[PDB]
DNA sequence: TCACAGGATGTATATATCTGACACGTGCCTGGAGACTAGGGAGTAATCCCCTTGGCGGTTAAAACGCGGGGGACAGCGCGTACGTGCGTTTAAGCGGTGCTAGAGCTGTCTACGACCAATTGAGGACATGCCCGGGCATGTT
DNA sequence: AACATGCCCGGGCATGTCCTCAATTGGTCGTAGACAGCTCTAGCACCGCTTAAACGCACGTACGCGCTGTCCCCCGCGTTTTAACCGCCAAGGGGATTACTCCCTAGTCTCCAGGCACGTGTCAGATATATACATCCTGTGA
């Protein structure tokens, strides 16, 4: 169905200097997740681990939370709600925390919460923020994307943006970033193809 | 009318050939000459009569003969034209 | 009113310019005919006419006659190499022919 | 009477201006008439075709001037051209 | 007695008939030949003496001209006599 | 049927500096939508997305609305109401928001309204105006045109002008612009043809 | 640019009537255009003189018919005349 | 129109040509009709003979050579065109008997 | 330029004579042929040029040649006209 | 070895060249000959290739036609070989 | 809509030797109706006179009738009812005898009847049979076809067969024939094209 | 789900000499439907017309019916019910006659019936049998296949056999035939590929 | 066997007799120049595109050059038939009227068609506008 | 990495409409043709007389046709050299096309003299007859 509104996608580093980072994975065939700085785009396999780093210039208050949401990149599709396709919605792959229809999951975190927004009808996944561990300048969240971008009756090949928001206890906005996502069978091949088209 | 082609006498054929510088003759010439003359004369007549019929006359005039001749590359002076 | 002077008189020609302009400008030859054209042609005809008559008159005196006859015109035309092209195929009444006898026919 | 223009007048006048003490027999005169008409038809015919070929409306001294060269041998052509030039030159000048 | 050698008269006749201007075919014969030919195309056709003379003079001219060319062909074959072949050759050369 | 009046097509930027803009699409034979600045003309496929940008020198009040209406360009036909043809008027292709017979639709927007004017008999589609996102410079509306210009019994090959009006909450005229529209199966081929004929 | 007159269309159509399966080279088509224009000029030129001599005011089927008989050999003339006669006859009835 | 006379050749063209070329002041409308029929008839005679000539050489197409042969193989046309030259016509394969070996 | 009459070469003269069915060609023919061909060319060109000059062109076209040929009693097809 | 006793080739050439349509003269030299003559009447004349083609076909046609008649004259003299005087005769008969 | 059945299209000359014939029309521009024996196909313009001849070896009884019906030629479309397109169905071109929606009409005959068959939903037009006029071997009926084959929402570029049935006063079959029909702007152009393709 | 049984696939011409036939369509890349005699296999696009001919040596009684059913060709999967995938099951493409979940439909025929077998859980589509006209040798039924073989959650790339059975008005078995079916985007490409593998 | 002188025949020049050429005068009939106005042709200037003219390199055929033998051609000789020439006789042509009818030639009057001009509708080719399948890319399994 | 398999834009083809030129239809006015009538000339037909030409028969030489021998032109084949032919590129001039302006021509009007046609008279040419010059035939010379 259609939403009454479109989430803002503008980058906003805020008081804490918020930003996103990603692992230096290669473009090999067998790669499960890889990121392109040139495209600001993540390429990943369905249900595989997708590390996203959170970077800040100063530590946010306790009770700060991190939310991930998907929207279609093309402006005419922006009001449609991104969701899993009917096949993957019916199949028995829920982890006991995520609703069957949600596209984005967070793995390894018991404090995760999944929202189907009563006003906008948007799906999103939220976790608490935690400051970086010893020997890292950043905090890493492991996402899983539960449909390929190509799934018919789902995203149906339309590109999506993952929007990441840093938020306070009430859900007010502390910072925002976004990156394009492709969920596909061969991330290394597809990343190289799109980076090559950048010269064409 | 018939046989007036014989009217073209053998000496007359001599005289014509004499004017053309001809000195000595084979009798075959007489019959061949009459053939050639007939063809030439017949073609001229046929044209002249055709003009006459076009004008819807009964009588051929010199002008019809002049035109009949002329077109075959035979401009004739002295009869009009 | 200015008293009439004929175009033949203006051009200094004997042949009648007005007639010629009529023979050009009507009787299916042309769309338009300019005034100099008849004059030019009349002179040409006059010149050629004179050439034939001049040659023929000599032939007439070579035959001690004061009156030109068809024979003389024939002789003139065939003795002049250029006329013999211009009128090459013409036939002339009572013209006769030139006294041409081939050398191989002569007695010896 | 029914009318037929002939050149006999002018033909004899030209003779008188060449061999004053001579005359023309009626048959020689008939010939000169056909001669004039023949040369007249040719030049008029050729001048007509020149204008046609060049897709243009007026017969002028030039078309005749050209026709004369095509019809006449060179020697006659040049004399004739000279005369035709003078007659027109004088006529326009007078 | 006298008696010309076979084939001398010609040179007189040649000059006489080259020199003179009268017609060489007789009037009545030629006239009837014209009518005899013309009737085949149209009966009751009628004539002008000027027209008949005009035909005659063209025919004599045609034959005389033909004979001269015929004569040259015979000379070219180095013969004294003209033959039908000489006529045919000359005509064929003129595309007749 | 015939209208009692002709809508004014005169450009009027008004107090807010209202102007239109369009995307830099190529001239590919069967491109979905493409615009010609040289002709001030849009070339688009039937029912496909037609992005129109709204540009302003200052932001209009809240409650402002944007209306689109079609008129025939040729003066003789200006009094006729531009509508869909009998075939596309009967076809079952309504989206649950637009009336069957309206030529112009807006996609994506749940707050759209469709007017059949009781006085002029004209058809028009309206949405609330929205300002650009912070860091953007214009607002994009996505129109769909629901008949080819060639439809017999409808536009019947007659060119149309889309008139865009900026309006207050009551329909009062705040600003006006217009562009010529061709709805056709092969927009890029047709666009190139018209731009070449501009040199002839 | 400029545009041209020729008979190539009609020549092509006639060829189909005599030989439906046979094509024609552009060069042969060139010949045929000269042939048509030549025969046209002869007939028109002759018919012109027939009218001139008889001092008549016009070219009619008659002058053409006569001219055809003067230009063509007899056999071709017969057939040509028959066709011309039918054409004028039919055209008059049509 | 041509469909009136049943002709393929265009009468009105012929009519305009007859009005020009300085042939005459005036025309009787049967004239171009009659002339068109004649030109068409002669055209057919040549093309028909030419197609046969093309078939003898086993070609589906007429070339100037075939017109040349076809014309000369009908002495009526040979006479009518007895002064014409045909571009790339070639000539007839006539050898005089006196030249052959014996 | 010059000496292009020598450009009408001997075997080319022979080939023409082969079209004429000629079986044997004497040594003197080639000169005589060249002379004849020159006269024919001179007459045709002179007339063609005259047509071109009359039109005040510098360029001789096929039509100029076709006309120059026509009036010499010879019509050419296949070059226009 | 083998070599022809003469003339069978000549008959073959007659066959071939009578069969074939193309130019038998050289393609370029004739064009220069046209310039060389034309300049005598006027300098700086310019030549359409089509015009020069027309001249070629006319000249070949003229010479071929002349050779036909030349051949007949030679046959009439019952000679195997053609001679200048054969050409001269055929021309003079044709009124050149 | 669809039909419960397909009319038989088989050629059946019956007791009377029934056959069809057509005029020897050319292939020129503006030709109203032209028939191809090679294709067994009639090419005609919208609303123009289409003469169809009826041939018989012996005369049927008085009260015999002649019926024309259109079916789609392609076997998967045979069950759809052939009818006019929505535009031509609405336009004011009824002659006072034909219903607005019927594809085939008969002109010049006051005894024409139009049937919308209650059981099969098929349209057809019927007239009395008449024997040939004195000196004629056949009887001519003038049909009109009231939509182009290309009309969208109508025949929509699908070929149709016209079926002609000779039948008694109760509608029982006496004889049957059929021919393909194309209704188009240029029957001569199209007929030549389809006949030329027969050699390719 | 899994069926309690596997339908018999054995060919049985029966009392009426029943056989199947197929059109001589080529292998143009995107040909809508094409058949391989070498593989006894049909290659066709989703929802497109699949003409199957019915051949008989004598006409079956009135009230005879023709039924089509699908089974998986691999013995490991023969007990699974061939059905549409969850996406195509939910989408709004029912023609007003077929249930949403059925793989096989018959187009054009108003007298079609769809059975979901209470005992075997097998889907099938049925129509009345119709004889050909006396000089035509076979009757053509036009099937549609409503999922690609590759549909995930449905056929999931597993090959299927279509089983065709002739029945009386009570459903007793009068004859049976079968053929393999691949439902795919490029039937001509795929047919050539599998026939080339027959030489490998 | 080949060419010139005297006589005869053909062509040119003079005298006698008769006809035609040529010269001079009067009345009739346009034909011709002088004159004026307006659509048009022709002329002059400007601009753009294609062809002609000019240049260079490589490869093949044409042509040029040389020798030998066959046939053609030329020269000379012999025999028979046909043509040419002379004389005499008969018929036709030419010449010179005599008579009659049709056609040609010319004039007048009336009708139809042609020519010329405008408007309306069709012929022909080019363009205006949409759907399929193919090509190729997009995206997944082994 | 290669093969498995779905989806969108492009080339082409499918199919409806426009613009430019030709044909058709109608009207108006003038000229030519068509049709009829009348007059005179020429043609056609017929008869008589005289001379030349043609026809027929007889007689002789040259020309034509046929045959043989001798010498040089030509053809045929091989080898070597030069330009033709072919392929590709560049610049300038000419020809073609379009617009604008003036003067030749055409068309229509008026008036006077010359030419044309017919009539009248004398001188020199034309023809016929007779004499001299040029060419041919017969006889004579080399």
PDB file of N, CA, C and O in Angstrom, chain K residues 38-55:
ATOM      1  N   UNK K  38      -6.538 -14.696 -54.885  1.00  0.00           N
ATOM      2  CA  UNK K  38      -5.374 -15.444 -54.412  1.00  0.00           C
ATOM      3  C   UNK K  38      -5.404 -15.637 -52.897  1.00  0.00           C
ATOM      4  O   UNK K  38      -5.028 -16.702 -52.393  1.00  0.00           O
ATOM      5  N   UNK K  39      -5.838 -14.616 -52.157  1.00  0.00           N
ATOM      6  CA  UNK K  39      -5.921 -14.662 -50.700  1.00  0.00           C
ATOM      7  C   UNK K  39      -7.317 -15.019 -50.190  1.00  0.00           C
ATOM      8  O   UNK K  39      -7.481 -15.239 -48.984  1.00  0.00           O
ATOM      9  N   UNK K  40      -8.310 -15.095 -51.078  1.00  0.00           N
ATOM     10  CA  UNK K  40      -9.733 -15.141 -50.709  1.00  0.00           C
ATOM     11  C   UNK K  40     -10.050 -14.074 -49.663  1.00  0.00           C
ATOM     12  O   UNK K  40     -10.573 -14.353 -48.581  1.00  0.00           O
ATOM     13  N   UNK K  41      -9.728 -12.828 -50.003  1.00  0.00           N
ATOM     14  CA  UNK K  41      -9.782 -11.735 -49.043  1.00  0.00           C
ATOM     15  C   UNK K  41     -10.316 -10.469 -49.696  1.00  0.00           C
ATOM     16  O   UNK K  41      -9.920 -10.128 -50.815  1.00  0.00           O
ATOM     17  N   UNK K  42     -11.208  -9.772 -48.991  1.00  0.00           N
ATOM     18  CA  UNK K  42     -11.753  -8.496 -49.442  1.00  0.00           C
ATOM     19  C   UNK K  42     -11.099  -7.359 -48.661  1.00  0.00           C
ATOM     20  O   UNK K  42     -11.012  -7.414 -47.430  1.00  0.00           O
ATOM     21  N   UNK K  43     -10.642  -6.337 -49.383  1.00  0.00           N
ATOM     22  CA  UNK K  43     -10.022  -5.147 -48.807  1.00  0.00           C
ATOM     23  C   UNK K  43     -10.948  -3.968 -49.106  1.00  0.00           C
ATOM     24  O   UNK K  43     -11.297  -3.743 -50.269  1.00  0.00           O
ATOM     25  N   UNK K  44     -11.353  -3.219 -48.075  1.00  0.00           N
ATOM     26  CA  UNK K  44     -12.313  -2.134 -48.294  1.00  0.00           C
ATOM     27  C   UNK K  44     -12.123  -1.009 -47.278  1.00  0.00           C
ATOM     28  O   UNK K  44     -11.441  -1.169 -46.262  1.00  0.00           O
ATOM     29  N   UNK K  45     -12.737   0.143 -47.570  1.00  0.00           N
ATOM     30  CA  UNK K  45     -12.727   1.304 -46.683  1.00  0.00           C
ATOM     31  C   UNK K  45     -13.961   1.327 -45.778  1.00  0.00           C
ATOM     32  O   UNK K  45     -15.008   0.760 -46.098  1.00  0.00           O
ATOM     33  N   UNK K  46     -13.822   2.016 -44.643  1.00  0.00           N
ATOM     34  CA  UNK K  46     -14.922   2.179 -43.691  1.00  0.00           C
ATOM     35  C   UNK K  46     -16.130   2.835 -44.366  1.00  0.00           C
ATOM     36  O   UNK K  46     -16.005   3.870 -45.027  1.00  0.00           O
ATOM     37  N   UNK K  47     -17.303   2.210 -44.205  1.00  0.00           N
ATOM     38  CA  UNK K  47     -18.617   2.710 -44.631  1.00  0.00           C
ATOM     39  C   UNK K  47     -18.817   2.786 -46.154  1.00  0.00           C
ATOM     40  O   UNK K  47     -19.838   3.321 -46.607  1.00  0.00           O
ATOM     41  N   UNK K  48     -17.898   2.256 -46.960  1.00  0.00           N
ATOM     42  CA  UNK K  48     -18.046   2.291 -48.413  1.00  0.00           C
ATOM     43  C   UNK K  48     -18.771   1.039 -48.928  1.00  0.00           C
ATOM     44  O   UNK K  48     -18.882   0.029 -48.232  1.00  0.00           O
ATOM     45  N   UNK K  49     -19.288   1.133 -50.159  1.00  0.00           N
ATOM     46  CA  UNK K  49     -20.030   0.034 -50.788  1.00  0.00           C
ATOM     47  C   UNK K  49     -19.116  -1.158 -51.072  1.00  0.00           C
ATOM     48  O   UNK K  49     -18.087  -1.018 -51.739  1.00  0.00           O
ATOM     49  N   UNK K  50     -19.505  -2.337 -50.571  1.00  0.00           N
ATOM     50  CA  UNK K  50     -18.774  -3.593 -50.776  1.00  0.00           C
ATOM     51  C   UNK K  50     -19.671  -4.600 -51.494  1.00  0.00           C
ATOM     52  O   UNK K  50     -20.404  -5.364 -50.845  1.00  0.00           O
ATOM     53  N   UNK K  51     -19.645  -4.641 -52.831  1.00  0.00           N
ATOM     54  CA  UNK K  51     -20.490  -5.597 -53.576  1.00  0.00           C
ATOM     55  C   UNK K  51     -20.007  -7.032 -53.403  1.00  0.00           C
ATOM     56  O   UNK K  51     -18.854  -7.352 -53.699  1.00  0.00           O
ATOM     57  N   UNK K  52     -20.906  -7.901 -52.937  1.00  0.00           N
ATOM     58  CA  UNK K  52     -20.680  -9.347 -52.876  1.00  0.00           C
ATOM     59  C   UNK K  52     -21.715 -10.014 -53.778  1.00  0.00           C
ATOM     60  O   UNK K  52     -22.922  -9.791 -53.616  1.00  0.00           O
ATOM     61  N   UNK K  53     -21.251 -10.834 -54.727  1.00  0.00           N
ATOM     62  CA  UNK K  53     -22.146 -11.547 -55.638  1.00  0.00           C
ATOM     63  C   UNK K  53     -22.512 -12.913 -55.073  1.00  0.00           C
ATOM     64  O   UNK K  53     -21.685 -13.587 -54.453  1.00  0.00           O
ATOM     65  N   UNK K  54     -23.753 -13.325 -55.321  1.00  0.00           N
ATOM     66  CA  UNK K  54     -24.243 -14.659 -54.988  1.00  0.00           C
ATOM     67  C   UNK K  54     -24.413 -15.442 -56.286  1.00  0.00           C
ATOM     68  O   UNK K  54     -25.140 -15.006 -57.186  1.00  0.00           O
ATOM     69  N   UNK K  55     -23.741 -16.589 -56.383  1.00  0.00           N
ATOM     70  CA  UNK K  55     -23.820 -17.469 -57.544  1.00  0.00           C
ATOM     71  C   UNK K  55     -24.497 -18.775 -57.136  1.00  0.00           C
ATOM     72  O   UNK K  55     -24.255 -19.291 -56.041  1.00  0.00           O
TER      73      UNK K  55
END
